[PDB]
Amino acid sequence: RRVKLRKHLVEINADEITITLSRYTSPEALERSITALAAMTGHAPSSIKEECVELIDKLDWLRVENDVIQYPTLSKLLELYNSQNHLSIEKLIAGLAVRRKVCKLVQDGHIDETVYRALDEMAAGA
Amino acid sequence: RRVKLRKHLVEINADEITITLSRYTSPEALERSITALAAMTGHAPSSIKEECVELIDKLDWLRVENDVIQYPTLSKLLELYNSQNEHLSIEKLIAGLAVRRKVCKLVQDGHIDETVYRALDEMAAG
């Protein structure tokens, strides 16, 4: 009920808070997310870890075919865009999951007008 | 880190977390929200508390006919709807009523009729 499952992202809703996890979430960022949910819910950190771990295990990486797009690719692009403007990793993940031609261009290192236009589109939406 | 101010709601974005606060957030829910932001950011709770308090101070109540719509009105309506469509969050009912003067008046007068139920269906689909 508190959980919305997508292919690349999972969102966990607990009153005032929303936590969004992916396959790109680091173990440290996951420890903090688990403590942030435990302060809202009063649930044991052990039980929330187990659940969070099952949910990310059902998520997939971004892919140009079966070739996985890696975190430095995603972060170096986010830095490039934001030092010129805001775009969150959650919206870049969700935006690239529906833009095949853009995932290939990004994977090959061709950050052109087509890519810049996709990022403007992502930032202008939810 | 990133803050989105609206007339009745504020959203605070810190990596994996988004916290949404209003003038209707209780002291206890505001306590949990501050501790959840401190676990993400590593900032001092007393310092996060001052920031949230500054932002909640910039937000306004829902209003109709020279009056303020109070929390028991909003919560008793949320219970009424959700014990039937079992979902609408306080954040979406706030955002929905902020643009619906006739519905704010109907709710304030205790006339929860088809017009109200239709507005709530719209917010929950939305």
Author numbering:
A (entry chain A): 530 to 614, 618 to 658
B (entry chain B): 530 to 615, 618 to 657
From the paper:
The replication of the two chromosomes in the pathogenic bacterium Vibrio cholerae is coordinated by the binding of initiator protein RctB to a checkpoint sequence, crtS. Domains, I, II and III, interact with DNA via Helix-Turn-Helix (HTH) motifs and are essential for ori2 replication.
The C-terminal domain (IV) is essential for down-regulating Chr2 initiation and has been shown in vitro to play a crucial role in self-interaction, promoting cooperative DNA binding and oligomerization. The C-terminal region of RctB, named domain IV (RctBIV), is critical to downregulate Chr2 copy number through its involvement, directly or indirectly, in handcuffing activities and binding to 29/39 m15,16,29. The structure of RctBIV reveals that it is organized into two structural subdomains connected by an extended linker or hinge region. In the crystal, RctBIV retains a dimeric association, confirmed by Size Exclusion Chromatography (SEC). A DALI31 search confirmed the C-terminal subdomain as a protein recognition domain capable of forming transient homodimeric interfaces, with Z-scores between 3.7 and 5.4.
